[PDB]
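User: Predict the full complex structure for these chains.
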Amino acid sequence: DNIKKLTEPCVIGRPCFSNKINNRNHATIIIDTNYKPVFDRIDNALMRRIAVVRFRTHFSQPSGREAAENND
Amino acid sequence: LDGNKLFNIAQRILDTNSVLLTERGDHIVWINNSWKFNSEEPLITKLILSIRHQLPKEYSSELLCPRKRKTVEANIRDMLVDSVETDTYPDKLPFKNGVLDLVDGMFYSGDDAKKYTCTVSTGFKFDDTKFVEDSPEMEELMNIINDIQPLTDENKKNRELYEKTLSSCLCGATKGCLTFFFGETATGKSTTKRLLKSAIGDLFVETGQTILTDVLDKGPNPFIANMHLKRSVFCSELPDFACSGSKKIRSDNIKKLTEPCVIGRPCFSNKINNRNHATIIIDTNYKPVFDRIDNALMRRIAVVRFRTHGLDGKIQNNRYRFAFLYLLVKWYKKYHIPIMKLYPTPEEIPDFAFYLKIGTLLVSSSVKHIPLMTDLSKKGYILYDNVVTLPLTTFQQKISKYFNSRLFGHDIESFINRHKKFANVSDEYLQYIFIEDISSP
Amino acid sequence: PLMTDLSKKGYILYDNVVTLPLTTFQQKISKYFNSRLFGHDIESFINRHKKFANVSDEYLQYIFIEDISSP
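Assistant: Here is the predicted structure of the three-chain assembly.
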């Protein structure tokens, strides 16, 4: 539901002490992780709004520059 | 030529830069050789009345009537449009009667201190009479230091770490590393805390451990506003982690507070940006229990070990206070003028040694296993989806051979959950290969 | 210096720390601390500072005062 709501131009949210319900989103959302995300519901509308990139490059130190050099 | 006289008076007052406007929407004034700011007090009118004397005598008579003072205040408020940043000199320490520069050791007062906009102070007037390089005071301190912590070669590194941390505490910039005091009771921790408090005046503050485990975004939090523009925040008498049901000190919280600007809304204040220049010091008598251990978490952890087990009256009388400040500034000169740097102590907390030895003993996946898979299949290793995998039973027995599973069962389970890769629903493996398994010891 | 007697009663110096088995420790507290009065509090004491030396050496680093005296 969070991903679904965060993609529409109008975001529904009620702050305290205010009756405002509409917000305009002008920002790109970027989320960083080391593990595959887990979602409650799987549907076409969900993964028709998901794009990822692959960070397949590791920078290290000479202490471990040999063990991690030959890593898939 | 002679237009609005009150406007001329307002311009004359303003050109002396005796009143400033901050980005926080509040006005600050310069009275009694001190920068004071307040929202509910008539500071501007007081400044006008005080400055009346130095103006030419044809304006002083007009300045007496309060209505004219209100008019001049309105003009001043109207002609101020640009804001100026505050507390931009971390290398100087303001006192109740002036500002002391840490480099040359001499303290300014009066108009000289007005150059730097410092809104806080130690709370006690600085005196060079008590600050003397040649006295009995520092040799009196010298025996005290050895009484609390000697300079032995075994504790040489701990002592130099103590000196460097104490010097760094005087710096006015944001610090990314906190200090931990773990040791036996009645070892001088209270004495050192009182000495530091007397040294830094009002810059010291004490807060409980609730924020370490509570949500900082819920409800009003005047505490978060408390350590703003502070120099030392003390969390003492930590709860026994051994006690069942005790809330674990969340690592995400301490990751949040170590950042230069913590996001938060103070009560009756729209000040999103808060400056955290204070040194976090946490004193406990029991080894903490942690759940998640990570590199970035452990780069910022610094711990001072205290294994060593008339003074109170002199400290209460601040007899040793000025010599303590002299020692602190000498240490800051020896260490921090040459370079502004802070270094961690990444040896171990009583609960990080397991993680460190796990990281050292275990190696990441490498192609060197590929030529040996024929031998590896003899030891239980299997190739699933072109991935080297180890049976759960084999990993469990390998772990239990060296390290007890019943001890670190919570820790082992947490590590598995953090690093679980699913070759099967029941067989969860790790991206670690035992070095001794394939390489002779 | 008391380590030998500590092993005699049960406080084994595993991992450079005394390790008295919880069986002996609970027998001691039961013979001294009356069980019926504060059994729940005794269990809280046991489970608060609980430690295990190994699979079968669960221990607490507390030495009762007649044992701290050298025999």
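The interface with chain A takes residues 363-368 of chain B (CB under 8 Å).
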